[PDB]
Structures are given as C-alpha cells and as structure tokens.
Design a protein around this ligand. Sequence first.
Ligand SMILES: CCCN(C(=O)N[C@@H](CSCc1ccc(Br)cc1)C(=O)O)C(=O)c1cccc(C#Cc2ccc(F)cc2F)c1
Ligand SMILES: CCCN(C(=O)N[C@@H](CSCc1ccc(Br)cc1)C(=O)O)C(=O)c1cccc(C#Cc2ccc(F)cc2F)c1
Ligand SMILES: CCCN(C(=O)N[C@@H](CSCc1ccc(Br)cc1)C(=O)O)C(=O)c1cccc(C#Cc2ccc(F)cc2F)c1
Ligand SMILES: CCCN(C(=O)N[C@@H](CSCc1ccc(Br)cc1)C(=O)O)C(=O)c1cccc(C#Cc2ccc(F)cc2F)c1
Lengths: 145, 145, 145, 145
Amino acid sequence: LGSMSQSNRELVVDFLSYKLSQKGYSWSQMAAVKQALREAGDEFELRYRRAFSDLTSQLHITPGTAYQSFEQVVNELFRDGVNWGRIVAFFSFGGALCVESVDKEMQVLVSRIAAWMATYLNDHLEPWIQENGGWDTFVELYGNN
Amino acid sequence: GPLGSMSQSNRELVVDFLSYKLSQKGYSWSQMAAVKQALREAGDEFELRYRRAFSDLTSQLHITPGTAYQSFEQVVNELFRDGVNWGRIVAFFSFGGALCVESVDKEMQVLVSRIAAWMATYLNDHLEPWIQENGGWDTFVELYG
Amino acid sequence: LGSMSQSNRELVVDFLSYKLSQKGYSWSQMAAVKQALREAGDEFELRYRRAFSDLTSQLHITPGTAYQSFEQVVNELFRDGVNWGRIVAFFSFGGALCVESVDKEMQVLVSRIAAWMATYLNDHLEPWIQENGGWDTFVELYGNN
Amino acid sequence: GPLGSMSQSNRELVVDFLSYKLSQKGYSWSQMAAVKQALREAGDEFELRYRRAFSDLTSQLHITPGTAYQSFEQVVNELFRDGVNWGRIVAFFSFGGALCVESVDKEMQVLVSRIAAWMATYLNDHLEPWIQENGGWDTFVELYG
Ligand SMILES: CCCN(C(=O)N[C@@H](CSCc1ccc(Br)cc1)C(=O)O)C(=O)c1cccc(C#Cc2ccc(F)cc2F)c1
Ligand SMILES: CCCN(C(=O)N[C@@H](CSCc1ccc(Br)cc1)C(=O)O)C(=O)c1cccc(C#Cc2ccc(F)cc2F)c1
Ligand SMILES: CCCN(C(=O)N[C@@H](CSCc1ccc(Br)cc1)C(=O)O)C(=O)c1cccc(C#Cc2ccc(F)cc2F)c1
Ligand SMILES: CCCN(C(=O)N[C@@H](CSCc1ccc(Br)cc1)C(=O)O)C(=O)c1cccc(C#Cc2ccc(F)cc2F)c1
C-alpha cells in the first residue's frame, strides 16, 4: 500500500531529521533514538565484524521459521542477561542477517525479520528499557546530544 | 517505542535501522528508503560545496517566528524563478534544513515544525507536477544515488 | 513514490476524520474544508446534472493542453465574477471532467487536472477567499458545524 | 490551502475532492483512496449493525485523558485475543472512531490526536505483519469494497 501526499511530507521530515542530528539537534525523541541506534550499530559492526560472516547457516532462521523459534535464537544472545550493549548487538545481528538475505536472493525474509524484531523489542527489550532509564537514557549513552 | 510525532511504534525504529544498514551495502529497504538516502547524500554534497551561501539564512531569507506560508512561498519562488530542475530542488531541501538548524541555535525551535509543514506544502503545490512529469523521485535516485 | 509506515497512519486519520465529521466534529480546518466541499459538490451535482454531459468535447482540455489554456477555460466560468457558488462549480466541473477522462480511457489526464486545479486554486481563488471571510467562512456556509 | 496538521496544501484539498467524486462512479484516485473508501464503508456498516455495543466506550474500554499507550495496547489486545482477521480489524477502526467521537462530546478533544497516534502505533507493531501476510489492504478492498 502506498501514500503519495505523505510521500513529500515524509521526505521533508527525514531530511530535516538528518540535518538537525548533524548538529546534535533532534526532530523528536523517536528521531534521536534512530540516530543514536544507527551510530551505536556502526560502532558495533566496526569492532565485531568477525561475528558477521555466514550468519544464515548458523542462526537457523529461514522464511518458514516460526516467531517462537526466532525468539529462542535471540534469547541465546541474551542468555547472560540484557544490557545496552547486548541490545545494540541485537539490532546489528538483525541488520547483518537482512543483508545476507538480500545477498542470498531471499529478500522475502527481510520483512519477516523486521516484524520479528519489532515484536521481540516490544515484548522483551522495551520493558527492560523502561526499568533502566528509558529511551532517553539510550540517547544519553549513544547519541550525540 | 520512543515517542514520535505521529506514533510511538517499535517497528518504525527497527525499520529505520534496517534501512540504514541495507543502504550501507548497496541495497534498499524500499523505493522511499532509497529516495530518502539519495537526498541526504545530495544535501550533504550541496551544503559542503556551496557552504559560503549558508550564513544568516533566517535574515537573508526572512524566515522568522510568526512568518506566514504566503511569505515563505514568496521567498522560495525566487529560487525556482528560472525554472525547476533537480539541482534547485536539492537546494530547496538544504536551505530548509539550514534554516531549521539556524532556528534551534537561536532558541527558535518553534520554527522547525512550521518550516517542515511549509516545505511539504510548497512541494505539493509547486514542485509535484514537475517531479511527476520528470519521471518521479525514481529518476532522482537514478541520476544521483 | 510510496510510503508504508505512513500508510497505516494515513488510514487512521482518514477514518477518524470521516467518523468525527458524521457528528459535526472535525479533525482539523483542512478536514472541515474537505467534508464541506464534498458536500457542497454533491448538492451542486444534484441540481445541475444537466451541465455534465459530454464535457470533454466542449471544454477543449486534453492531455497536451497548456495550463494557460486551462486557465482561459476556467476563467470563462468566472467571467461574471467569483463567488462561493462559482467556486463549488469549479470543483464539480473538474471532478466530472476527471470521471469522463476515466470513461474515455485517458486516466493520464486526471493528475494533470488535479495539478492544474491546484495551481488555479492557489493563484486565483484562494486569494479571493482570503478577502471574503477565509476558509472558515466556507465551512460555516457549506459544512455541518 | 486550509490549515492542516502537516501542511496547508491546495493540491491536498483538490485531490481529496477528486478522489471522492471518482469513487462515486466506481473509480479510484489510487490504491490508497480505494482502501480509505472501502474502510469508511466497512466502518459505517459495522457501527450500524453492532450499534448496541457503542455506549460509554470511554468507560468500558478505559480510555481517559492521561491514558498511556501500554494501557491502550492492553485493551486492544483483548479484541484480537482469539486472532486477527479483517472483521476484527474493522471493529478496531470503528471502536477507535467512536472513542474519538465520545471524547469530543465530553470536551476531551485532547484525546483525539492521542487516540490516532495509538491506533497507528498498534497497527504498525501488532497488525501489519498479519495484513501483509494476508495479501495486504489490496485484499481488504477486494473482499469488501
Ligand atoms: C553465530 C553466533 C553469532 N554470535 C556471535 O558470533 N558472537 C560472537 C561474540 S562477538 C559479537 C558480540 C560482541 C558484543 C556483544 Br555485547 C555481543 C556479541 C562470538 O561468539 O564469537 C552471537 O553472539 C549470537 C549468539 C546467539 C544469537 C545471536 C543472535 C541473533 C539475532 C538473530 C536475529 C535477529 F533479528 C537479531 C539477533 F540478535 C547472536
Ligand atoms: C541567501 C541565499 C540566497 N541564495 C543564494 O545564495 N544563491 C547563490 C547560489 S549558490 C546556492 C545555489 C547553488 C546551486 C543552485 Br542549483 C541553487 C542555489 C548565489 O546565486 O549567489 C539562493 O540561492 C536563494 C535565493 C532565493 C531564495 C532562496 C531560498 C530559499 C528557501 C527558503 C526556505 C526554505 F525552506 C527553502 C528554501 F529553498 C535561496
Ligand atoms: C460546456 C459549458 C459547461 N458549463 C455549463 O454547462 N454551464 C451551464 C449552467 S448550469 C451549471 C452551473 C450552475 C451554477 C453555477 Br454558480 C455555475 C454553473 C449552462 O451554461 O447551461 C459551464 O458553466 C462552464 C462554462 C465555462 C467553463 C466551465 C468550466 C470549467 C472547468 C474546467 C476544468 C476544471 F478543472 C474546472 C472547471 F471549473 C464550465
Ligand atoms: C465495550 C466493547 C467491548 N466489545 C464488545 O462489545 N464486543 C461485543 C461483540 S459486538 C462487537 C464486535 C462485533 C464483531 C467483531 Br469481529 C468484533 C466485535 C460482544 O462480544 O458482546 C468488544 O468487542 C471489545 C472487547 C475488548 C476490547 C475492545 C476494544 C477496543 C478498542 C479500544 C481503542 C481503540 F482505539 C480501538 C479498539 F478497538 C472491544
């Protein structure tokens, strides 16, 4: 489904978000969390690139994977507990797995991964986030103002 | 999710993160994602190259608090005085971004969402038909990104 | 160009707009003007259906029509002056002409008509509107609260 | 144009008017327009048929001023307790519309934009993947409108 008058509005907000963040300003909390997370991810990938080779064959997540199985896989990443660094890792692994899915010509898995990750974030990680200083605490620790 | 302007969605944060990461590898979350990214990139290049033109824009372009859209439309018209093209449209985004940045600096953050709404308005009424007629943003992506 | 997370937000606002207006409430001024105009148009069409048969052959507006020629055609509708009733007529004639364009398998003309009508509204009619009580005066006279 | 939430575009008013008129003839401005229209229609039928269920919803569904999204998500979950389908999704829109209408009645117009944002949020996080997997809104249009 598409939306064309929103399209121009959407470009606007995205571009202004981008240019504000370059000066440490933020369109909104959501925009601040986005810049922060992108940045935290970049740094993460720079340091742990070694972990991102052949993720497909190791994580056992395919298009026909059930969310419960996805949940079991991610749970392994958080076996010794949830902390900010582990939450960044979660995003980075999702991202890398998407890229592989595109490399391997299974684009279909990308939107499956998005939806799985959103559910997991919703049910598992955001509640922890709310008990540990909230999304603003994420922005203080990883964002650029 | 974090508190946004129109929702506090977890999916929205995930989707932004995957879009970014897909783009770093030569891929796209979607056509919109690709447009957004090409436009950020084009804005960055424009602002560095024509850096000398980005001082006291709130004054040179007469955008103050209490400005009405008709005034804004009057100023932007001069930019497209000799016709629309993709360069002038990049200029339009960049100037509007620098205006917002200038606004926050001066503790006029109130201007920012107003500038957004004026830019979206101007696009819709003045720029859209030229854009469509010229192959759409799809063409922008192909010529730029 | 499409936009998918806005898509759900867009449905929301549209549906809530619709349900509010059914009780004489309005999401925004823009939403009030939309309900009012749709209604004014319905009434107009009911009374003057006789004027809407074979508009294509009489208005001389094709896909290759220049906006200046479009402007000349619409100007004829406003020859004896602009008033609210004539402004409603303008919308109704545009609408009917679009429908014929779809009947005659020239859909391409519809978006051309939208853009022409938006320019004409912008340059000719909205200024008159601003000197005659504004968009709220349109809502008082044609809307349902 | 009239003052909207995200812009004051003239095109936006035109486009809304032509969409309406195209739809009255069995046509569509676009896929989104068609979805919007089918959904309004489906909401109308649902609210008349299940009219008896639409009293004191602010109370039965505990949506008051100062309500947080987590609370809202908790209430809406019960509606989809036994699974998602297109009927339950129509119900979701209608109830949210009646809630907004109820809000304005009680001089709690402040709730309306908050309800919008919560509905958009819930759609994105909870309903989107089911919708996509089930053929998208394109399927809704084909089964309903
Ligand atoms: C094939 C194992 C992948 N992996 C690693 O390679 N870890 C590395 C450690 S170095 C990477 C690292 C660095 C810092 C932190 Br904090 C956590 C991890 C290793 O064991 O050598 C993992 O740590 C790991 C273990 C278990 C689950 C996952 C995952 C995942 C995942 C899948 C999908 C998705 F959408 C999101 C995800 F987080 C990731
Ligand atoms: C103070 C800036 C005035 N300005 C310039 O400095 N132009 C420069 C050219 S260098 C900038 C440039 C470079 C390439 C292109 Br294509 C277009 C412009 C000059 O001719 O010396 C403009 O190009 C100009 C002239 C008239 C109006 C505008 C504007 C604007 C504007 C205002 C608000 C907003 F949201 C967006 C806008 F684009 C911008
Ligand atoms: C082929 C003539 C169409 N037309 C009529 O048939 N008028 C009727 C009068 S009855 C319709 C009517 C009723 C009330 C009012 Br106020 C104004 C008109 C007639 O002369 O018998 C017009 O009045 C007319 C005359 C000149 C121009 C136009 C137009 C137009 C138009 C075209 C495109 C567009 F996007 C918007 C437009 F308004 C419409
Ligand atoms: C006070 C209404 C409670 N309610 C009912 O009356 N259900 C009725 C069924 S008749 C309504 C109906 C008819 C068909 C379908 Br499919 C689903 C519901 C009943 O079982 O007697 C619900 O269906 C119900 C139950 C639990 C939660 C909700 C809700 C909600 C809601 C809140 C906010 C919002 F923005 C959107 C929402 F959908 C609605």
